[PDB]
Amino acid sequence: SMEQVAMELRLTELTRLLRSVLDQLQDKDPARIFAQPVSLKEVPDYLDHIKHPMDFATMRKRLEAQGYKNLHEFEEDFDLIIDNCMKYNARDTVFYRAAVRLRDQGGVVLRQARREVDSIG
Secondary structure, three states: HHHHHOOOHHHHHHHHHHHHHHHHHHHOOOOOOOOOOOOOOOOHHHHHHOOOOOHHHHHHHHEEEEEOOOOOHHHHHHHHHHHHHHHOOOOHHHHHHHHHHHHHHHHHHHHHHHHHHHOOO
């Protein structure tokens, strides 16, 4: 149906906007601490601690399959990146600190992304 196509075009345009958002958030991680999944070879207990691991490569795979239906879903995954790190790692670590700085810097990007999502529809 034409209605189905129109909905598909809206999801495509959302995907474009989310890709730009993703790029901007990942620029706020110049150390590439959040770029890839925590390796279970290197941190074998990780899944005892963290029940829903997340990282930027995993988000990018979801995104390119148009797997984010709205901005809330994308933000949920971004928050997992931060929140998982802040639980597993202590306050005195480069990991935790990186997460805090990513959260603080990413909030600015996401604030305007929400306005754009609402504005364009």
